[PDB]
A paper describes a structure:
Manganese peroxidases (MnPs) are, together with lignin peroxidases and versatile peroxidases, key elements of the enzymatic machineries secreted by white-rot fungi to degrade lignin, thus providing access to cellulose and hemicellulose in plant cell walls. The primary mechanism involves the MnP oxidation of Mn2+ to Mn3+ and the subsequent formation of chelates with fungal dicarboxylic acids.
Comparison of the crystal structures of Mn-free Ape-MnP1 and Mn-bound Ape-MnP1 shows that the Asp35 side chain occupies different positions. In addition, Gln333 located at the C-terminal end does not even appear in the Mn-free Ape-MnP1 structure due to the predicted mobility of this region in the absence of the cation. The different orientation of the Asp35 side chain in the structures of substrate-bound and substrate-free Ape-MnP1, and the absence of Gln333 in the crystal structure of the Mn-free enzyme, confirm the mobility of these residues, a behavior that has also been demonstrated for the two glutamates of the Mn2+ oxidation site in previously characterized MnPs. The movements of these two residues witness the dynamic nature of the Mn2+ oxidation site in Ape-MnP1, a dynamic that is different from that reported for MnP of P. chrysosporium and VP of Pleurotus eryngii, since the C-terminal tails of the latter are not involved in Mn2+ coordination. The kinetic constants of Ape-MnP1-Q333P confirmed that Gln333 participates in Mn2+ binding (a 172-fold decrease in Mn2+ affinity was observed for the mutated variant) but not in its oxidation (kcat was hardly impaired). Accordingly, based on these results and the structural studies described above, we propose that the position of the Asp35 and Gln333 side chains in Mn-free Ape-MnP1 corresponds to an “open-gate” conformation of the active site, necessary for cation uptake. The subsequent reorientation of the side chains of these two residues pointing toward the Mn2+ ion in Mn-bound Ape-MnP1 corresponds to the “closed-gate” conformation, in which the enzyme oxidizes the cation in direct contact with the internal heme propionate after being activated by H2O2.
Numbering used by the authors: 1 to 332
């Protein structure tokens, strides 16, 4: 079917989503891989992962928006109130054509296309409205152990490879608003507007510093001024179950993107039955091709500053970016 805009879709029910995509790209994200895009991506996880085989929760069901009055009382959802302040008006204005679970997955898929190197993910619609708030304690916290993290993701059907890709990859285009005391927009990697593998390098370095005037539980030292490091990422890069996976993504942007895209799509289906959904992948914007060079070590860092954790292979011999140590700019 040809939509009013000229887009051909396999299922004509998808045509009603085209204005939603345009609104998100023009008016929420403003064509940028910035604060709004980051929020929409994070919302995908906080909505979808909140499901357990034994404790309940509906997964990718829109509960985090509909039942925000409950789910925003959960510690793991710190900062989601601010995300919903930005995204929530768009969810409401487009609630005539799609359910909230569908909207959240759409917005995350569209967010990625705003970012250099991020994959164009598949997208399906047809998730029913949510029945209830997720239980508490289903969203992983940055102070959770690797074993805890792998149990949560693994029990939901993710491989370890997918788990590392989807966490690390997301943190390549991300910052913290609630970790560095009284500071917002503090990136996890040197390039929060680029979907590159700098996050993988940055986290493998020995940490030497904390930003700001104190820590929050689940934060550890970072190696690069103007960034922050989560304990969870720190441990995932160093634990024997995940460290070879973590290292495998360094300077492998295409591989990382492909795995990430597969993982996001899997995440999008949590709590759903793929049978009763409709493919609407044609509505997702074109991806922005990765246009940056190889991964590098940050200025002033050398291979002796890498904490080797993968026993199978040495850390790739990357170049060091030229020039003086500089503080990474905060995300506007
Ligand atoms: C063990 C798993 C994970 C943990 C513990 C974790 C933890 C965090 C924390 C603590 C923050 C900063 C939040 C704030 O300061 O308010 C954050 C930001 C973010 N996370 Fe993760 N995360 C995980 C997995 C993921 C996944 C799977 C995705 C995407 C599907 C994701 C996407 C993001 C994004 C995009 C941001 C930045 C938000 C912004 O700049 O507004 N995270 N994460
Ligand atoms: Ca949910
Ligand atoms: Ca990056």
């Amino acid at each position: 079917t040809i939509c009013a805009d000229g887009t051909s879709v396999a299922n004509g029910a998808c045509c009603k989503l085209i204005p939603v995509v345009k609104d998100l790209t023009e008016n929420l994200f403003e064509g940028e891989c910035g604060d709004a895009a980051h929020g929409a991506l994070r919302l995908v996880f906080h909505d979808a992962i909140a499901i357990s085989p034994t404790l309940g929760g509906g997964g990718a069901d829109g509960s985090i928006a509909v039942f925000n009055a409950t789910e925003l009382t959960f510690h793991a959802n710190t900062g989601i109130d601010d995300v919903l302040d930005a995204v929530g008006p768009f969810l409401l204005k487009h609630s005539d054509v799609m359910t909230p679970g569908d909207f959240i997955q759409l917005a995350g898929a569209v967010s990625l296309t705003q970012c250099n190197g991020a994959p164009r993910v598949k997208f399906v619609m047809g998730r029913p409205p949510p029945k209830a708030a997720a239980p508490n304690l289903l969203v992983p916290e940055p102070f959770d152990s690797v074993a805890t993290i792998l149990q949560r993701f693994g029990e939901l059907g993710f491989t370890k490879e997918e788990t590392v890709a989807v966490i690390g990859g997301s943190h390549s285009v991300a910052g913290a608003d609630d970790i560095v005391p009284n500071e917002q927009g503090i990136p996890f990697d040197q390039t929060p507007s680029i979907f590159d593998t700098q996050i993988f390098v940055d986290v493998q370095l020995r940490g030497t510093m904390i930003p700001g005037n104190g820590t929050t539980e689940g934060e550890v030292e970072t190696a690069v001024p103007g960034t922050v490091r989560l304990q969870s990422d720190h441990l995932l890069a160093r634990d024997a179950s995940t460290s070879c996976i973590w290292q495998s993504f360094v300077n492998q942007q295409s591989k990382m993107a492909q795995v990430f895209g597969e993982a996001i799509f899997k995440m999008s289906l949590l709590g759903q039955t793929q049978s009763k959904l409709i493919d609407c992948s044609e509505v997702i914007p074109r991806a922005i091709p990765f246009s940056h060079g190889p991964a590098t070590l940050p200025p002033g860092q050398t291979l002796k500053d890498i904490e080797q954790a993968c026993a199978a292979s040495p850390f790739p011999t990357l170049s060091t970016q030229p020039g003086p140590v500089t503080s990474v700019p905060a995300i506007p």
